[PDB]
Amino acid sequence: MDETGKELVLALYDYQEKSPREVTMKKGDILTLLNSTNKDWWKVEVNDRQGFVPAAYVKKLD
């Protein structure tokens, strides 16, 4: 079930991938948290791609 991540994050803002290293998340989407090395950006898996998104556009569900 929650095999890729036990803690998931909610996308609060429609974020368009500016580069292939970024991921496109829609407002209301549920993203899987992989790595949170920085407070600026978190590494999340969106659909198929893993990438970094700004933590100010997402909120944890906990």
Coordinates of all heavy atoms in Angstrom, one line a residue:
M1 N 0.8 -1.2 0.0 CA 0.0 0.0 0.0 C 0.9 1.3 0.0 O 1.2 1.8 -1.1 CB -0.9 0.0 1.2 CG -2.1 -1.0 1.1 SD -3.2 -0.9 2.5 CE -4.4 -2.1 2.0
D2 N 1.3 1.7 1.2 CA 2.2 2.8 1.3 C 3.6 2.4 1.3 O 4.3 2.6 2.3 CB 1.8 3.6 2.6 CG 0.4 4.1 2.6 OD1 0.0 4.8 1.7 OD2 -0.3 3.6 3.6
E3 N 4.0 1.7 0.2 CA 5.3 1.0 0.1 C 6.4 2.0 -0.4 O 7.5 1.8 -0.1 CB 5.1 -0.2 -0.8 CG 4.4 0.2 -2.1 CD 3.6 -1.0 -2.7 OE1 2.6 -1.4 -2.0 OE2 4.0 -1.5 -3.7
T4 N 6.0 3.0 -1.1 CA 7.0 4.0 -1.6 C 7.2 5.0 -0.6 O 8.3 5.7 -0.6 CB 6.5 4.6 -2.9 OG1 5.2 5.1 -2.8 CG2 6.6 3.6 -4.1
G5 N 6.2 5.2 0.3 CA 6.4 6.2 1.4 C 5.2 6.1 2.3 O 4.0 6.1 1.9
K6 N 5.5 6.1 3.6 CA 4.4 6.1 4.6 C 3.8 7.5 4.8 O 2.7 7.7 5.1 CB 4.9 5.6 5.9 CG 3.9 5.4 7.0 CD 2.8 4.5 6.7 CE 3.3 3.0 6.6 NZ 3.8 2.6 7.9
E7 N 4.7 8.5 4.7 CA 4.3 9.9 4.8 C 4.2 10.5 3.4 O 5.1 10.5 2.6 CB 5.3 10.7 5.6 CG 5.0 12.1 5.9 CD 5.9 12.8 6.9 OE1 6.9 13.3 6.5 OE2 5.6 12.8 8.1
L8 N 3.0 11.0 3.1 CA 2.7 11.6 1.8 C 2.4 13.1 1.9 O 2.0 13.5 3.0 CB 1.6 10.8 1.0 CG 1.9 9.4 0.6 CD1 1.7 8.4 1.8 CD2 1.1 9.0 -0.6
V9 N 2.6 13.8 0.8 CA 2.4 15.2 0.9 C 1.3 15.7 -0.1 O 1.1 15.1 -1.1 CB 3.7 15.9 0.5 CG1 4.1 15.8 -0.9 CG2 3.7 17.4 0.9
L10 N 0.6 16.7 0.3 CA -0.5 17.2 -0.5 C -0.1 18.5 -1.3 O 0.5 19.4 -0.7 CB -1.7 17.6 0.4 CG -2.9 18.2 -0.2 CD1 -3.6 17.2 -1.2 CD2 -3.9 18.7 0.8
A11 N -0.3 18.5 -2.6 CA 0.1 19.6 -3.4 C -0.9 20.7 -3.3 O -2.1 20.5 -3.7 CB 0.2 19.1 -4.9
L12 N -0.5 21.9 -2.8 CA -1.4 23.0 -2.5 C -1.4 24.0 -3.7 O -2.3 24.9 -3.8 CB -1.0 23.7 -1.3 CG -1.0 22.9 0.0 CD1 -0.5 23.8 1.2 CD2 -2.3 22.3 0.3
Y13 N -0.5 23.8 -4.7 CA -0.4 24.7 -5.8 C 0.0 23.9 -7.1 O 0.8 23.0 -7.0 CB 0.7 25.7 -5.4 CG 1.0 26.7 -6.6 CD1 0.2 27.7 -6.9 CD2 2.2 26.6 -7.3 CE1 0.5 28.6 -8.0 CE2 2.6 27.5 -8.3 CZ 1.7 28.4 -8.6 OH 2.0 29.3 -9.6
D14 N -0.6 24.3 -8.2 CA -0.3 23.7 -9.5 C 1.1 24.1 -9.9 O 1.3 25.3 -10.3 CB -1.4 24.2 -10.5 CG -2.8 23.7 -10.2 OD1 -3.1 22.5 -10.3 OD2 -3.6 24.6 -9.8
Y15 N 2.0 23.2 -9.9 CA 3.4 23.4 -10.2 C 3.8 22.7 -11.5 O 3.7 21.5 -11.6 CB 4.3 23.0 -9.0 CG 5.7 23.3 -9.2 CD1 6.2 24.5 -8.9 CD2 6.6 22.3 -9.6 CE1 7.6 24.8 -9.0 CE2 8.0 22.5 -9.8 CZ 8.4 23.8 -9.4 OH 9.8 24.0 -9.6
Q16 N 4.2 23.5 -12.4 CA 4.6 23.0 -13.7 C 6.1 22.7 -13.7 O 6.9 23.6 -13.3 CB 4.2 24.0 -14.9 CG 2.8 24.3 -14.9 CD 1.9 23.1 -15.3 OE1 1.7 22.8 -16.5 NE2 1.4 22.4 -14.3
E17 N 6.5 21.5 -14.2 CA 7.9 21.2 -14.3 C 8.6 22.2 -15.2 O 8.3 22.2 -16.4 CB 8.0 19.7 -14.8 CG 7.4 19.5 -16.1 CD 7.5 18.0 -16.6 OE1 6.6 17.3 -16.2 OE2 8.4 17.7 -17.3
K18 N 9.6 22.9 -14.7 CA 10.3 23.8 -15.5 C 11.5 23.1 -16.2 O 12.0 23.6 -17.2 CB 10.9 25.0 -14.6 CG 11.4 26.1 -15.4 CD 12.0 27.2 -14.5 CE 12.5 28.4 -15.3 NZ 13.1 29.4 -14.5
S19 N 11.8 22.0 -15.7 CA 12.9 21.1 -16.3 C 12.6 19.7 -16.0 O 11.7 19.3 -15.2 CB 14.2 21.5 -15.6 OG 14.2 21.3 -14.2
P20 N 13.2 18.7 -16.8 CA 13.0 17.3 -16.6 C 13.4 16.8 -15.2 O 13.0 15.7 -14.8 CB 13.9 16.7 -17.6 CG 14.2 17.8 -18.6 CD 14.2 19.0 -17.8
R21 N 14.1 17.7 -14.4 CA 14.5 17.3 -13.1 C 13.3 17.7 -12.1 O 13.4 17.4 -10.9 CB 15.7 18.1 -12.7 CG 16.9 17.8 -13.6 CD 17.3 16.3 -13.7 NE 18.4 16.1 -14.6 CZ 18.6 15.0 -15.3 NH1 17.7 14.0 -15.2 NH2 19.6 14.8 -16.1
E22 N 12.3 18.4 -12.6 CA 11.2 18.8 -11.8 C 10.0 18.0 -12.2 O 9.9 17.3 -13.2 CB 10.9 20.3 -12.1 CG 12.0 21.2 -11.6 CD 11.9 22.6 -12.1 OE1 11.0 23.3 -11.7 OE2 12.8 23.0 -12.9
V23 N 9.0 18.0 -11.3 CA 7.8 17.2 -11.5 C 6.5 18.1 -11.5 O 6.5 19.2 -10.8 CB 7.6 16.2 -10.4 CG1 8.5 15.0 -10.6 CG2 7.9 16.8 -9.0
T24 N 5.6 17.8 -12.3 CA 4.3 18.5 -12.4 C 3.3 18.0 -11.4 O 2.8 16.9 -11.5 CB 3.8 18.5 -13.8 OG1 4.7 19.1 -14.7 CG2 2.4 19.2 -13.9
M25 N 2.9 18.8 -10.5 CA 1.9 18.5 -9.5 C 0.7 19.4 -9.6 O 0.9 20.6 -9.7 CB 2.5 18.5 -8.1 CG 2.9 19.9 -7.6 SD 3.7 19.8 -6.0 CE 4.0 21.6 -5.7
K26 N -0.5 18.9 -9.5 CA -1.7 19.6 -9.6 C -2.3 19.9 -8.2 O -2.0 19.0 -7.3 CB -2.8 18.9 -10.4 CG -3.2 17.6 -9.9 CD -4.1 16.8 -10.9 CE -3.2 16.2 -12.0 NZ -2.4 15.1 -11.5
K27 N -2.9 21.0 -8.0 CA -3.5 21.3 -6.7 C -4.5 20.3 -6.3 O -5.5 20.1 -7.0 CB -4.2 22.7 -6.7 CG -4.7 23.1 -5.3 CD -5.3 24.5 -5.4 CE -6.6 24.5 -6.2 NZ -7.2 25.9 -6.3
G28 N -4.3 19.6 -5.2 CA -5.2 18.5 -4.7 C -4.6 17.2 -5.0 O -5.3 16.2 -4.7
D29 N -3.4 17.1 -5.5 CA -2.8 15.8 -5.8 C -2.0 15.3 -4.6 O -1.7 16.1 -3.7 CB -1.8 15.9 -7.0 CG -1.7 14.6 -7.8 OD1 -1.0 13.7 -7.2 OD2 -2.1 14.6 -8.9
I30 N -1.8 14.0 -4.5 CA -1.1 13.4 -3.4 C 0.2 12.8 -3.9 O 0.3 11.9 -4.7 CB -2.0 12.2 -2.8 CG1 -3.4 12.7 -2.4 CG2 -1.3 11.6 -1.6 CD1 -3.4 13.7 -1.3
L31 N 1.3 13.4 -3.3 CA 2.6 13.0 -3.8 C 3.3 12.2 -2.7 O 3.1 12.4 -1.5 CB 3.4 14.3 -4.1 CG 2.8 15.3 -5.0 CD1 3.7 16.4 -5.4 CD2 2.2 14.6 -6.3
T32 N 4.2 11.3 -3.1 CA 4.9 10.5 -2.2 C 6.3 11.1 -1.8 O 7.1 11.4 -2.7 CB 5.1 9.1 -2.8 OG1 3.9 8.5 -3.2 CG2 5.8 8.1 -1.7
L33 N 6.5 11.2 -0.5 CA 7.8 11.8 -0.1 C 8.9 10.8 -0.1 O 8.8 9.7 0.6 CB 7.6 12.4 1.4 CG 6.8 13.6 1.4 CD1 6.3 13.9 2.9 CD2 7.5 14.8 0.9
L34 N 10.0 11.1 -0.8 CA 11.1 10.2 -0.8 C 12.3 10.7 0.1 O 12.7 10.0 1.0 CB 11.6 10.0 -2.3 CG 11.0 8.9 -3.1 CD1 11.1 7.5 -2.5 CD2 9.5 9.2 -3.3
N35 N 12.7 11.9 -0.2 CA 13.8 12.5 0.6 C 13.5 14.0 0.9 O 13.0 14.7 0.0 CB 15.1 12.4 -0.2 CG 15.5 11.0 -0.6 OD1 15.1 10.5 -1.6 ND2 16.3 10.4 0.3
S36 N 13.8 14.4 2.1 CA 13.6 15.8 2.5 C 14.9 16.4 3.0 O 15.0 16.7 4.2 CB 12.5 15.9 3.5 OG 11.3 15.2 3.1
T37 N 15.9 16.5 2.1 CA 17.2 17.0 2.5 C 17.3 18.5 2.8 O 18.1 18.9 3.5 CB 18.2 16.7 1.4 OG1 17.6 17.0 0.1 CG2 18.6 15.2 1.4
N38 N 16.3 19.2 2.2 CA 16.3 20.7 2.4 C 14.9 21.1 2.8 O 13.9 20.4 2.6 CB 16.7 21.4 1.1 CG 18.2 21.3 0.8 OD1 18.7 20.3 0.2 ND2 18.9 22.3 1.2
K39 N 14.8 22.3 3.4 CA 13.6 22.9 3.8 C 13.0 23.7 2.7 O 11.8 24.2 2.7 CB 13.7 23.8 5.1 CG 14.7 25.0 4.8 CD 14.7 25.9 6.0 CE 15.2 25.3 7.3 NZ 16.6 24.8 7.2
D40 N 13.8 23.9 1.6 CA 13.4 24.6 0.5 C 12.7 23.7 -0.5 O 11.6 24.1 -1.0 CB 14.6 25.3 -0.2 CG 14.2 26.0 -1.5 OD1 13.6 27.1 -1.4 OD2 14.5 25.5 -2.6
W41 N 13.2 22.5 -0.7 CA 12.6 21.6 -1.6 C 12.6 20.1 -1.1 O 13.5 19.8 -0.3 CB 13.4 21.6 -2.9 CG 14.9 21.4 -2.8 CD1 15.8 22.3 -2.6 CD2 15.5 20.1 -2.9 NE1 17.1 21.7 -2.6 CE2 16.9 20.4 -2.7 CE3 15.1 18.8 -3.1 CZ2 17.9 19.4 -2.8 CZ3 16.1 17.8 -3.1 CH2 17.4 18.1 -2.9
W42 N 11.6 19.4 -1.4 CA 11.5 18.0 -1.1 C 11.5 17.1 -2.3 O 11.0 17.5 -3.4 CB 10.3 17.7 -0.3 CG 10.2 18.4 1.1 CD1 11.3 18.8 1.8 CD2 9.0 18.7 1.8 NE1 10.8 19.3 3.0 CE2 9.5 19.3 3.0 CE3 7.7 18.5 1.6 CZ2 8.6 19.7 4.0 CZ3 6.8 19.0 2.6 CH2 7.2 19.6 3.7
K43 N 12.1 15.9 -2.2 CA 12.1 15.0 -3.3 C 10.9 14.1 -3.3 O 10.7 13.3 -2.4 CB 13.4 14.1 -3.3 CG 13.5 13.2 -4.5 CD 14.7 12.2 -4.3 CE 14.8 11.3 -5.5 NZ 15.9 10.4 -5.4
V44 N 10.0 14.3 -4.2 CA 8.7 13.6 -4.2 C 8.6 12.8 -5.5 O 9.2 13.1 -6.5 CB 7.5 14.5 -4.1 CG1 7.5 15.2 -2.7 CG2 7.5 15.5 -5.2
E45 N 7.8 11.7 -5.5 CA 7.5 10.9 -6.7 C 6.1 11.3 -7.2 O 5.1 11.1 -6.5 CB 7.6 9.4 -6.4 CG 7.5 8.6 -7.6 CD 7.7 7.1 -7.3 OE1 8.9 6.7 -7.1 OE2 6.7 6.3 -7.3
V46 N 6.1 11.8 -8.4 CA 4.8 12.3 -8.9 C 4.5 11.4 -10.2 O 5.2 11.6 -11.2 CB 4.9 13.7 -9.3 CG1 3.5 14.2 -9.8 CG2 5.4 14.6 -8.2
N47 N 3.5 10.6 -10.1 CA 3.1 9.6 -11.1 C 4.2 8.6 -11.4 O 4.2 7.5 -10.9 CB 2.8 10.4 -12.4 CG 1.5 11.2 -12.3 OD1 0.4 10.6 -12.5 ND2 1.6 12.5 -12.1
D48 N 5.2 9.0 -12.2 CA 6.3 8.1 -12.6 C 7.7 8.7 -12.3 O 8.7 8.0 -12.1 CB 6.2 7.8 -14.1 CG 7.1 6.7 -14.5 OD1 8.2 7.0 -14.9 OD2 6.6 5.6 -14.5
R49 N 7.8 10.1 -12.2 CA 9.0 10.7 -12.1 C 9.2 11.2 -10.6 O 8.3 11.6 -9.9 CB 9.1 11.9 -13.0 CG 10.5 12.7 -12.9 CD 10.4 14.0 -13.7 NE 10.2 13.7 -15.2 CZ 9.8 14.6 -16.0 NH1 9.6 15.9 -15.6 NH2 9.6 14.3 -17.3
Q50 N 10.5 11.1 -10.2 CA 10.9 11.7 -8.9 C 11.6 13.0 -9.1 O 12.5 13.1 -10.0 CB 11.8 10.7 -8.1 CG 11.2 9.3 -8.0 CD 12.1 8.3 -7.3 OE1 13.3 8.5 -7.2 NE2 11.5 7.3 -6.6
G51 N 11.3 14.0 -8.3 CA 11.9 15.3 -8.5 C 11.7 16.2 -7.3 O 11.0 15.8 -6.3
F52 N 12.3 17.4 -7.4 CA 12.2 18.3 -6.2 C 11.2 19.4 -6.4 O 11.1 20.0 -7.5 CB 13.6 18.9 -6.0 CG 14.3 19.4 -7.2 CD1 14.1 20.7 -7.7 CD2 15.2 18.5 -7.9 CE1 14.7 21.1 -8.9 CE2 15.8 19.0 -9.1 CZ 15.6 20.2 -9.5
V53 N 10.4 19.6 -5.4 CA 9.4 20.6 -5.4 C 9.5 21.5 -4.1 O 9.9 21.0 -3.1 CB 7.9 20.1 -5.4 CG1 7.6 19.4 -6.8 CG2 7.7 19.1 -4.3
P54 N 9.2 22.8 -4.2 CA 9.3 23.7 -3.0 C 8.3 23.4 -1.9 O 7.1 23.2 -2.2 CB 9.0 25.1 -3.7 CG 9.1 24.9 -5.1 CD 8.7 23.5 -5.4
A55 N 8.8 23.3 -0.7 CA 8.0 22.9 0.4 C 6.9 23.9 0.8 O 6.0 23.6 1.5 CB 8.9 22.6 1.6
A56 N 7.0 25.1 0.2 CA 6.0 26.1 0.4 C 4.8 26.0 -0.4 O 3.8 26.8 -0.3 CB 6.7 27.5 0.2
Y57 N 4.8 25.0 -1.3 CA 3.6 24.7 -2.2 C 3.0 23.4 -1.8 O 2.1 22.9 -2.6 CB 4.1 24.8 -3.6 CG 4.6 26.1 -4.1 CD1 5.9 26.2 -4.7 CD2 3.9 27.3 -3.9 CE1 6.4 27.4 -5.0 CE2 4.4 28.5 -4.3 CZ 5.7 28.6 -4.9 OH 6.2 29.8 -5.3
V58 N 3.5 22.8 -0.8 CA 3.0 21.5 -0.4 C 2.8 21.4 1.1 O 3.4 22.2 1.9 CB 3.9 20.3 -0.8 CG1 3.9 20.1 -2.3 CG2 5.4 20.6 -0.3
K59 N 1.9 20.5 1.6 CA 1.7 20.3 3.0 C 1.6 18.8 3.3 O 1.0 18.1 2.6 CB 0.4 21.0 3.4 CG 0.1 20.8 4.9 CD -1.3 21.3 5.3 CE -1.6 21.1 6.7 NZ -1.6 19.6 7.1
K60 N 2.2 18.4 4.4 CA 2.2 17.0 4.8 C 0.9 16.6 5.4 O 0.2 17.4 6.0 CB 3.3 16.7 5.9 CG 4.7 16.9 5.4 CD 5.7 16.5 6.5 CE 7.1 16.6 6.0 NZ 8.1 16.2 7.1
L61 N 0.5 15.4 5.1 CA -0.7 14.8 5.8 C -0.3 13.9 6.9 O 0.3 12.8 6.6 CB -1.6 14.1 4.8 CG -2.0 14.9 3.6 CD1 -2.8 14.0 2.6 CD2 -2.9 16.1 4.0
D62 N -0.5 14.3 8.1 CA 0.0 13.6 9.3 C -0.8 13.8 10.5 O -1.5 12.8 10.9 CB 1.5 14.0 9.6 CG 2.0 13.3 10.8 OD1 2.2 12.1 10.8 OD2 2.3 14.0 11.8

